[PDB]
Amino acid sequence: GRVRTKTVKKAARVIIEKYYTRLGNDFHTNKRVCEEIAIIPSKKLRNKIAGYVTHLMKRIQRGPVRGISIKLQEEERERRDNYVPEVSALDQEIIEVDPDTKEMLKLLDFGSLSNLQVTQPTVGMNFKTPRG
Amino acid sequence: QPIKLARVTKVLGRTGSQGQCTQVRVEFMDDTSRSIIRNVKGPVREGDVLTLLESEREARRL
Amino acid sequence: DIKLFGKWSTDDVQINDISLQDYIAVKEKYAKYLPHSAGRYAAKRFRKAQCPIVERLTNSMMMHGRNNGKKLMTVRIVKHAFEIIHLLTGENPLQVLVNAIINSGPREDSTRIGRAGTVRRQAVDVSPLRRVNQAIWLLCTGAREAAFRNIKTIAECLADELINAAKGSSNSYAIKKKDELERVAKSNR
Amino acid sequence: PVNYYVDTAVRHVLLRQGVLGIKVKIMLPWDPTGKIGPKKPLPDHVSIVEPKDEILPTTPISEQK
Amino acid sequence: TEQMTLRGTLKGHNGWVTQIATTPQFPDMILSASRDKTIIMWKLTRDETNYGIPQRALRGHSHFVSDVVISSDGQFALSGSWDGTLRLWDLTTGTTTRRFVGHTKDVLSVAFSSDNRQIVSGSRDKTIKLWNTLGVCKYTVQDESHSEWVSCVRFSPNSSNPIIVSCGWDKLVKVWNLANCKLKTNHIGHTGYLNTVTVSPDGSLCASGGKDGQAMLWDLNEGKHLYTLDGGDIINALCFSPNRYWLCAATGPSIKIWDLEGKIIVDELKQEVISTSSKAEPPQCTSLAWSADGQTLFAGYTDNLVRVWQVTIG
Amino acid sequence: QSVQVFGRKKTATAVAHCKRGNGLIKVNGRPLEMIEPRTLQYKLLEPVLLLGKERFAGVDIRVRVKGGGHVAQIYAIRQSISKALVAYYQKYVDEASKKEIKDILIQYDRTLLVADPRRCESKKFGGPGARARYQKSY
RNA sequence: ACGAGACUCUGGCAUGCUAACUAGUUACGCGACCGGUCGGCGUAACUUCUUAGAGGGACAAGUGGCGUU
C-alpha cells in the first residue's frame, strides 16, 4: 500500500532531470532542497517526493535509469564507452574460411590471402530441425 | 503410525476451497536427502518444524 | 524476582518438544509475573506468537459475552487453580501446563480440496499455532461446561481439566473431543 | 479544494410551460495578488523553478576591492 | 606516515553523529552532536574493555543539532539546531542557560570568535547573522550576500583581526572582516556546492570541499589559489592537526590525510567488512576531529558509533 | 529535585515527581503496595523487582494519577516511575546508571518508556457500535 | 484531464517557542500526624502534565531477503 502516484513520480523525475547537482542521498537533505527549489503546497507531498527522489538516487548509482535522462549521464556514458582494446578482436593471425567462401574470395581477387585457413565443410547435411 | 519432524524450506503457496491450507516443502532432518510437499492447516511459518502423522502421504502439487 | 507469581519456578522448564518449543516457550526475560498487558498481541500476525502461553490462555477465559473483557477475573481465576494444581499434582504449575496443552491439541485435520470438490476431504498437518489456540479454547469450553449447571465453580474446573489433560485421561472434554475429531479424520483419510 | 476553487450557484427560471433549473459550477483560477481566485494552488500541483544558466568556473578569478 | 589503527569503539546511541567538538586546553572534554536531537560528553579511559560510557547527555533541540563548537573554557557549549535556534549549554547543572532565536531555518554550521565574544551563524535562509554573547543583534548580511544556502562559516583564529569565511551552495566562498563587514573577496572555481570549510589556527590555509571531490586551499593573508588536493566525493569534514601537520578530510566513506608541505597522502584508511551476504555500501563518516594531544582521531559516522583511531607508534 | 516527567495510558495520565531523599516512594500521597484491587500490584511494582531496591533507595518519587477509568489510571504509574527515574538520572547524576536501567527495562518491557498509541476510535453512524452497523432487513 | 491519490477535520510526539490569578507542579505557623500523606489560603519561578497557536515530525526513510533486481 506504498505505491507512489504519478504526481510524486513525475515531480521527482523532473527534479532529478533538472537539478541533479544540488540533491544528494539523505532524505532529510533532499526534502530541504526540494522545498527550496519547488512550490510544494503540502509537507506530506514534499516528504513523498523527496523519498522517491532518494530512492531514485539509490537507483542511479547502480546504473542509468530508464526514465531518467540528463546530458550529464549521456557524457558520462560516452566516457564509459570510450573503451578500446589493445588488440582488435577482429584481425588475427589465422581465420577459418570455408571452401565456398574461398571460391567467392578468389572471384574477388582476394583469394590469395595467406591469413585464410581452408577449413573443411560440415561432414553431413543435417541442418533442419525435425518437423512435427 | 510413527511421528517425525521436517524443516520447512520454501512456503510454496496457499490453497483450499475458501483457502485454509499452506502448501509447503519440508526437508527431513534424519535423511536430508528426501523432501516432500505437504499442505499444513493453520498459520504456518518458514524454517519451523511440523508434526506429520503419515510420511507416505502427500497432497496435490500445483 | 523473575518467577511467575513469585512462587512458580522459571528454571525447571523442559524442552519437551525438541523443535516445537519455539511456539510453546516461557524461558526468556519477557516472561513477566502478572499475565495482564492489555490486548496489543492481536494487532499483527504472530505478534501473538512471542507472547508467553500463560498470558494467552488467561486471555482466552472471557467468553459468552456476559464476561467479555473481564481480564481481572481471568488472572485471578488462573492464579487460583495454579496455586491448586501443582499442589494436588506436585510438579510446576508451568511444566504441567505445557504438558496439558501439548496433550490436548489435535495434530491432523480434514479439509476439502479442489475447485468444486463437494464429496470428500483430505487429511492435513496442523500447525503449532492453530492447534494450541484451538486446544486452549477446548480447555476453556470444558471448564465452562463443568461450571455450567454443575456443582463445580470457576477457577476450579480449569485445575482438574489441566490435570486430566496432563494425565491423558478421557475425563477432560478437551482430549475426548480431540479423539472424536481424530476418529472423524481417520475415517476421512 | 472544491471549498474555495469551485463556486456553486443554483437558480430557477419561471416559464409559461414550466420551471427550469439552472446549476452553475465555476472553477476560479490560481490568482495570487488580487484574490479574485484562490491565493493557494491545487494541492496536487507541483511547480519546479527552471535551472539558471551560469558560466561554469574553471579557475579562481577574483578582483580586489 | 604512521598507520592509523582503531583502538576501542563506542556504541550506544540512536542517531548519526553530525559534529565532534574538541578542545586543546582540556585533554578530557570532547563534545558530540547527534541528530537524535542531543549533545553527548565523553570521558576517555584508553583501555581495552571499552572506550568508556558517556557521562552527560543534553537534550534541548526540537530538531537535529547541526554543528556544535566549544569555547576556550570547556564549561560552555554552543549548539545550533535544524529548527533555526541556538542554545548555550552550561554543564554545571545539565540545562541550557540561554536560547537565542535570530534565524528562521536550519542553521547549518556555527562558529565562535577567537576571544569567544562573537557568534556568527549561517542558515539555509540565505543569510548570515553576527551577534554578541548577549544575543543582541549586531549584523545581518543579506544584501550582496550568498545567493544560496550558507553551509558553513568560521572565524580566523589568529592574532590579527578576526576574518570570516563563508561557503555556500552557490559554488562560491565569501570572505569578510568584522571592522565594517564589507564585500572584499569572493572565491570561485568550484563547480559544486561547498559543504564545510576549515582554517588552520595560524591564518594561512583554508580548505573547502564537497560533492566535487577536490579541496581548495586559500591563504588568509593573500586570498589567491595555491594548489588542488583531489580526493573522493562528499567532503563533509575537514580538520587540521594542532599537534601535527595533518589535514584530514572524510571524502566519502574513506578518510584522506594530507600534509601541508608535500600535499601527498599519509595513509589511506581502508575499511571493509567481510561477509558472503553484503549488498549495502559501507557507512559514511560525517565528522572528523583530533584530540587535545592531536594523536588520536575521532570519526563520527552515520552508523550511530564513533570510530576512534590511535597512532600505531611506528 | 523535580523532573515532573508524567506518563500516559488512554486518556488517563500519571505524573511522577522525583527528588533527592530517603528513597521511599509514594503514590497518590500513599504508600506503594496497598492498592485496593491487589490484582495488578506486581504489575506496577515491576520496576523494583527488576532494577533492584538499591536503585530505588536513593530517590523519593511522589506520583499523582488523574484520568477516567480505573484500569486506565493504572498502567501509567509504572511508566511514569521509570520515565521519572530516567529523566532524574540523565538530568542530575550521570548517563551510565540511567543507561543500564533503561537497557534492562527495555530488554524486559518496551512499554515502560514509551506511551501507548492506542486510543478510542470514533463511532460512525448507521450502527450501534463503532464499526458494527444495524441489522439489515432481508 | 476528471475520479483515486494529494487534500480538509480528527488522534499518536514535542522538557523547542509565544502563555493564564477560570485548570495546575514545585513554596514555611495558618488545618494537623511517633520528619511525614493532607483541593482552606498569597505573592512569587513563569509552563511539565492542563487549553489552543506557530512550527517541526513519517518518507517503505535505514538495514536483511524476495521481485523481469
CSV table of C-alpha atoms in Angstrom, one decimal, chain E:
chain,number,residue,atom,x,y,z
E,1,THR,CA,53.4,8.2,7.6
E,2,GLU,CA,52.1,6.3,10.7
E,3,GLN,CA,49.4,3.7,10.4
E,4,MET,CA,46.1,4.8,11.9
E,5,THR,CA,44.6,1.9,13.8
E,6,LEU,CA,41.3,1.7,15.6
E,7,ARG,CA,41.8,1.2,19.4
E,8,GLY,CA,38.4,0.9,21.0
E,9,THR,CA,35.0,1.6,19.5
E,10,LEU,CA,32.0,3.2,21.2
E,11,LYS,CA,28.3,2.5,20.7
E,12,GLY,CA,25.0,3.1,22.5
E,13,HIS,CA,23.2,5.9,20.6
E,14,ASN,CA,20.2,6.1,18.4
E,15,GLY,CA,21.2,8.6,15.8
E,16,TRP,CA,24.0,9.7,13.4
E,17,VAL,CA,27.0,11.7,14.7
E,18,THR,CA,27.0,15.1,12.9
E,19,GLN,CA,29.7,17.1,14.7
E,20,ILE,CA,32.6,16.4,17.1
E,21,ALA,CA,33.9,19.3,19.1
E,22,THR,CA,37.3,19.1,20.7
E,23,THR,CA,39.2,21.5,23.0
E,24,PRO,CA,43.0,21.8,23.1
E,25,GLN,CA,43.1,23.2,26.6
E,26,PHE,CA,41.5,20.2,28.4
E,27,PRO,CA,42.6,16.7,27.5
E,28,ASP,CA,39.3,15.1,28.6
E,29,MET,CA,36.3,17.2,27.4
E,30,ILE,CA,35.1,16.4,23.9
E,31,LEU,CA,31.6,17.2,22.7
E,32,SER,CA,29.5,15.1,20.2
E,33,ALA,CA,26.4,16.4,18.3
E,34,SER,CA,23.9,13.7,17.3
E,35,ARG,CA,20.7,14.0,15.2
E,36,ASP,CA,18.9,12.1,17.9
E,37,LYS,CA,18.5,15.7,19.0
E,38,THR,CA,21.2,15.6,21.6
E,39,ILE,CA,24.8,16.5,22.6
E,40,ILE,CA,26.9,14.0,24.3
E,41,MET,CA,30.0,14.1,26.6
E,42,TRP,CA,32.9,11.6,26.6
E,43,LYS,CA,35.4,10.6,29.3
E,44,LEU,CA,38.2,8.7,27.5
E,45,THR,CA,39.8,5.9,29.6
E,46,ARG,CA,42.2,4.4,27.0
E,47,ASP,CA,41.6,0.8,28.0
E,48,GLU,CA,40.9,-2.5,26.3
E,49,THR,CA,37.4,-3.1,27.7
E,50,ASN,CA,35.6,-0.1,26.3
E,51,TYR,CA,36.4,3.5,25.4
E,52,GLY,CA,34.1,4.5,28.3
E,53,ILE,CA,30.4,5.3,28.7
E,54,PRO,CA,29.3,8.8,28.0
E,55,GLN,CA,28.9,11.0,31.1
E,56,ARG,CA,26.3,13.6,30.2
E,57,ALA,CA,23.5,13.8,27.6
E,58,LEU,CA,21.9,17.2,26.8
E,59,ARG,CA,18.5,17.4,25.1
E,60,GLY,CA,17.2,20.8,24.1
E,61,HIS,CA,16.7,20.8,20.3
E,62,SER,CA,13.3,20.3,18.7
E,63,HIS,CA,15.2,19.2,15.5
E,64,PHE,CA,18.6,17.7,14.8
E,65,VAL,CA,21.6,19.6,16.2
E,66,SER,CA,23.7,20.5,13.2
E,67,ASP,CA,27.1,21.8,14.5
E,68,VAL,CA,28.5,22.4,18.0
E,69,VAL,CA,31.6,24.3,18.9
E,70,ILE,CA,33.3,24.7,22.3
E,71,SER,CA,34.8,27.8,23.8
E,72,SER,CA,38.2,28.5,25.3
E,73,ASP,CA,36.6,27.1,28.5
E,74,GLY,CA,35.0,23.7,28.4
E,75,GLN,CA,32.1,24.6,30.6
E,76,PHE,CA,30.1,26.4,27.8
E,77,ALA,CA,29.0,24.8,24.6
E,78,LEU,CA,27.1,26.4,21.6
E,79,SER,CA,24.7,24.2,19.6
E,80,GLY,CA,22.6,25.2,16.6
E,81,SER,CA,19.6,23.1,15.7
E,82,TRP,CA,17.8,22.4,12.4
E,83,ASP,CA,14.8,24.4,13.8
E,84,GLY,CA,16.6,27.7,13.5
E,85,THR,CA,17.6,28.2,17.1
E,86,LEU,CA,20.9,28.3,19.1
E,87,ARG,CA,21.5,27.1,22.6
E,88,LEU,CA,24.3,28.0,25.1
E,89,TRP,CA,24.7,24.9,27.3
E,90,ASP,CA,26.3,25.3,30.7
E,91,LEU,CA,27.5,21.9,32.2
E,92,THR,CA,27.1,22.8,35.9
E,93,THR,CA,23.5,21.5,36.0
E,94,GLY,CA,22.8,19.9,32.7
E,95,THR,CA,20.5,22.6,31.4
E,96,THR,CA,20.6,25.4,28.9
E,97,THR,CA,21.1,28.9,30.5
E,98,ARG,CA,20.3,30.7,27.2
E,99,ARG,CA,18.5,30.1,23.9
E,100,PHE,CA,18.9,32.6,21.1
E,101,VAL,CA,16.4,33.0,18.2
E,102,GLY,CA,17.8,35.0,15.3
E,103,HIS,CA,17.4,32.7,12.3
E,104,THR,CA,14.2,31.1,10.9
E,105,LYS,CA,15.6,28.0,9.2
E,106,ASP,CA,18.2,25.3,9.9
E,107,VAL,CA,21.5,26.8,11.0
E,108,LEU,CA,24.0,24.5,9.2
E,109,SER,CA,27.4,25.3,10.9
E,110,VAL,CA,28.2,27.5,13.8
E,111,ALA,CA,31.5,29.1,14.8
E,112,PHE,CA,33.0,31.1,17.7
E,113,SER,CA,35.2,34.2,17.8
E,114,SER,CA,38.9,33.9,18.9
E,115,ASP,CA,38.1,35.5,22.3
E,116,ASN,CA,34.7,33.8,22.4
E,117,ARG,CA,32.6,37.0,22.2
E,118,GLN,CA,31.0,36.9,18.7
E,119,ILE,CA,28.5,34.4,17.4
E,120,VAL,CA,28.4,34.0,13.6
E,121,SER,CA,25.8,31.7,12.3
E,122,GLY,CA,24.7,30.7,8.8
E,123,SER,CA,21.4,29.0,7.8
E,124,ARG,CA,19.5,27.9,4.6
E,125,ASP,CA,17.6,31.2,4.9
E,126,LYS,CA,20.2,32.6,2.5
E,127,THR,CA,21.6,34.9,5.2
E,128,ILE,CA,24.4,35.2,7.8
E,129,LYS,CA,23.9,36.7,11.3
E,130,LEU,CA,26.5,38.0,13.7
E,131,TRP,CA,25.6,38.6,17.3
E,132,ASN,CA,27.4,39.2,20.6
E,133,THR,CA,27.4,36.9,23.6
E,134,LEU,CA,24.3,38.7,25.0
E,135,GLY,CA,22.3,37.9,21.9
E,136,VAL,CA,21.7,41.5,20.8
E,137,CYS,CA,21.5,41.6,17.0
E,138,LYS,CA,24.7,43.2,15.6
E,139,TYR,CA,24.9,42.4,11.9
E,140,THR,CA,22.7,40.7,9.3
E,141,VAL,CA,24.4,40.1,5.9
E,142,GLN,CA,21.6,39.9,3.4
E,143,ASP,CA,22.4,42.4,0.6
E,144,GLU,CA,25.1,41.2,-1.9
E,145,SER,CA,25.5,38.1,0.3
E,146,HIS,CA,25.4,34.4,-0.7
E,147,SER,CA,22.6,33.8,-3.2
E,148,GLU,CA,22.1,30.2,-1.8
E,149,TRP,CA,22.4,28.4,1.5
E,150,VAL,CA,25.4,29.2,3.6
E,151,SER,CA,26.6,25.8,4.6
E,152,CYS,CA,29.5,26.9,6.8
E,153,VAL,CA,31.2,30.0,8.1
E,154,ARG,CA,34.1,30.3,10.6
E,155,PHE,CA,36.3,33.0,12.0
E,156,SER,CA,40.1,33.5,11.6
E,157,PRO,CA,41.6,32.5,15.0
E,158,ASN,CA,44.9,34.4,14.7
E,159,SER,CA,46.4,37.3,16.4
E,160,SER,CA,45.3,39.6,13.6
E,161,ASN,CA,41.8,40.9,13.1
E,162,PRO,CA,39.2,38.1,13.1
E,163,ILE,CA,38.1,37.3,9.5
E,164,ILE,CA,35.1,35.2,8.5
E,165,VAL,CA,35.0,32.8,5.5
E,166,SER,CA,31.5,31.6,4.5
E,167,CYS,CA,30.9,28.8,1.9
E,168,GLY,CA,27.6,28.3,0.2
E,169,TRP,CA,25.7,26.1,-2.3
E,170,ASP,CA,26.2,28.9,-4.8
E,171,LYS,CA,29.6,27.3,-5.6
E,172,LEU,CA,31.3,30.5,-4.3
E,173,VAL,CA,33.0,31.4,-1.0
E,174,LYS,CA,33.0,34.9,0.5
E,175,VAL,CA,35.4,36.4,3.0
E,176,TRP,CA,34.7,39.4,5.3
E,177,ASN,CA,36.2,41.3,8.1
E,178,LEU,CA,34.5,42.4,11.3
E,179,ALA,CA,35.6,46.0,11.2
E,180,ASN,CA,33.0,47.1,8.7
E,181,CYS,CA,31.5,43.9,7.2
E,182,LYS,CA,32.0,44.9,3.5
E,183,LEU,CA,32.5,42.7,0.5
E,184,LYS,CA,36.2,42.3,-0.2
E,185,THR,CA,37.0,38.8,-1.6
E,186,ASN,CA,34.9,36.2,-3.4
E,187,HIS,CA,36.5,32.9,-4.2
E,188,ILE,CA,35.3,30.9,-7.3
E,189,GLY,CA,36.4,27.9,-9.3
E,190,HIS,CA,34.3,25.3,-7.5
E,191,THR,CA,31.8,23.6,-9.9
E,192,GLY,CA,29.7,22.2,-7.0
E,193,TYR,CA,28.2,23.3,-3.7
E,194,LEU,CA,30.6,23.7,-0.8
E,195,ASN,CA,29.7,21.9,2.5
E,196,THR,CA,32.4,22.7,5.1
E,197,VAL,CA,35.4,24.9,5.4
E,198,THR,CA,38.2,25.0,8.0
E,199,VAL,CA,41.1,27.3,8.6
E,200,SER,CA,44.3,26.2,10.4
E,201,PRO,CA,44.9,28.1,13.7
E,202,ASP,CA,47.5,30.3,12.0
E,203,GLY,CA,45.6,32.2,9.3
E,204,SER,CA,47.5,30.7,6.4
E,205,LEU,CA,45.4,27.9,4.9
E,206,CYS,CA,41.7,27.5,4.2
E,207,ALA,CA,40.4,24.2,2.8
E,208,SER,CA,36.9,23.6,1.4
E,209,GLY,CA,35.2,20.6,-0.1
E,210,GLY,CA,32.0,18.8,-1.1
E,211,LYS,CA,30.5,16.6,-3.8
E,212,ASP,CA,33.1,17.9,-6.3
E,213,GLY,CA,35.7,15.9,-4.5
E,214,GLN,CA,38.5,18.5,-4.8
E,215,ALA,CA,39.7,20.6,-1.8
E,216,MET,CA,40.6,24.2,-2.5
E,217,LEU,CA,43.3,25.8,-0.3
E,218,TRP,CA,43.1,29.5,0.4
E,219,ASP,CA,45.7,31.8,2.1
E,220,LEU,CA,44.1,34.2,4.6
E,221,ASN,CA,46.7,36.9,4.0
E,222,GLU,CA,46.7,36.6,0.2
E,223,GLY,CA,43.4,35.1,-0.9
E,224,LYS,CA,44.7,33.5,-4.1
E,225,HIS,CA,44.8,29.9,-5.3
E,226,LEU,CA,47.7,27.7,-4.2
E,227,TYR,CA,47.0,24.0,-5.3
E,228,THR,CA,44.4,21.4,-5.6
E,229,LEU,CA,44.1,18.4,-3.2
E,230,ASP,CA,41.9,15.9,-5.1
E,231,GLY,CA,40.1,13.2,-3.2
E,232,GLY,CA,36.9,11.2,-3.0
E,233,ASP,CA,33.4,12.5,-3.2
E,234,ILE,CA,31.4,14.2,-0.5
E,235,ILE,CA,34.0,16.1,1.6
E,236,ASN,CA,31.9,16.5,4.8
E,237,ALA,CA,34.5,17.1,7.4
E,238,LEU,CA,37.8,19.0,7.1
E,239,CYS,CA,40.1,19.4,10.0
E,240,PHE,CA,43.8,20.2,10.6
E,241,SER,CA,46.1,18.7,13.2
E,242,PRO,CA,47.0,21.1,16.1
E,243,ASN,CA,49.9,18.9,17.3
E,244,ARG,CA,51.0,17.7,13.9
E,245,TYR,CA,50.8,18.7,10.2
E,246,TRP,CA,47.9,16.6,9.1
E,247,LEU,CA,44.7,17.8,7.4
E,248,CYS,CA,42.1,15.0,7.4
E,249,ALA,CA,39.1,15.1,5.1
E,250,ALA,CA,36.4,12.5,5.2
E,251,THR,CA,35.9,12.2,1.4
E,252,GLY,CA,33.1,9.7,1.3
E,253,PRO,CA,33.5,6.5,3.3
E,254,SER,CA,37.3,6.9,3.4
E,255,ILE,CA,39.4,9.5,5.1
E,256,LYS,CA,42.3,11.2,3.3
E,257,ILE,CA,45.1,12.6,5.5
E,258,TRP,CA,47.3,15.2,3.6
E,259,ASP,CA,50.3,17.2,4.6
E,260,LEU,CA,50.6,21.0,4.1
E,261,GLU,CA,54.2,20.5,2.8
E,262,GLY,CA,54.1,18.0,0.0
E,263,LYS,CA,50.4,17.8,-0.3
E,264,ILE,CA,50.6,14.0,-0.6
E,265,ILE,CA,48.8,11.2,1.3
E,266,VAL,CA,50.0,9.9,4.6
E,267,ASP,CA,47.8,6.8,5.0
E,268,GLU,CA,44.7,5.7,3.1
E,269,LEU,CA,42.3,4.4,5.9
E,270,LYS,CA,40.8,1.4,4.2
E,271,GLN,CA,37.7,0.0,5.9
E,272,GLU,CA,35.9,-3.2,4.9
E,273,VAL,CA,33.5,-5.8,6.5
E,274,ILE,CA,33.9,-9.3,5.1
E,275,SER,CA,30.6,-11.1,4.5
E,276,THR,CA,29.2,-13.6,2.0
E,277,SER,CA,25.9,-11.7,2.0
E,278,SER,CA,26.6,-7.9,1.5
E,279,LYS,CA,24.8,-5.6,-0.9
E,280,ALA,CA,24.9,-2.3,1.1
E,281,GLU,CA,27.6,0.3,0.8
E,282,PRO,CA,29.8,1.0,3.9
E,283,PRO,CA,28.6,3.7,6.3
E,284,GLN,CA,30.0,7.1,5.6
E,285,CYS,CA,31.8,9.2,8.2
E,286,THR,CA,30.3,12.7,8.8
E,287,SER,CA,32.7,14.4,11.2
E,288,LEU,CA,36.5,14.1,11.8
E,289,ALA,CA,38.4,15.5,14.8
E,290,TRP,CA,41.7,15.3,16.7
E,291,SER,CA,42.2,15.1,20.5
E,292,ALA,CA,43.8,17.7,22.7
E,293,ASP,CA,47.1,15.9,22.2
E,294,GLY,CA,46.3,15.6,18.5
E,295,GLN,CA,47.4,11.9,18.3
E,296,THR,CA,44.0,10.1,18.3
E,297,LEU,CA,41.3,10.6,15.7
E,298,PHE,CA,37.6,10.6,16.4
E,299,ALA,CA,35.3,9.9,13.4
E,300,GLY,CA,31.6,10.3,13.8
E,301,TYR,CA,29.7,8.3,11.2
E,302,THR,CA,26.2,7.5,10.1
E,303,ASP,CA,26.5,4.2,12.0
E,304,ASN,CA,25.5,5.7,15.4
E,305,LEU,CA,29.0,4.8,16.6
E,306,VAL,CA,32.2,6.9,16.7
E,307,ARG,CA,35.4,5.2,15.5
E,308,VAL,CA,38.5,6.1,17.4
E,309,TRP,CA,41.9,5.6,15.9
E,310,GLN,CA,45.2,5.7,17.7
E,311,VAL,CA,48.7,6.0,16.2
E,312,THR,CA,50.4,2.7,15.7
E,313,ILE,CA,53.7,4.0,17.2
E,314,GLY,CA,55.6,3.1,14.1
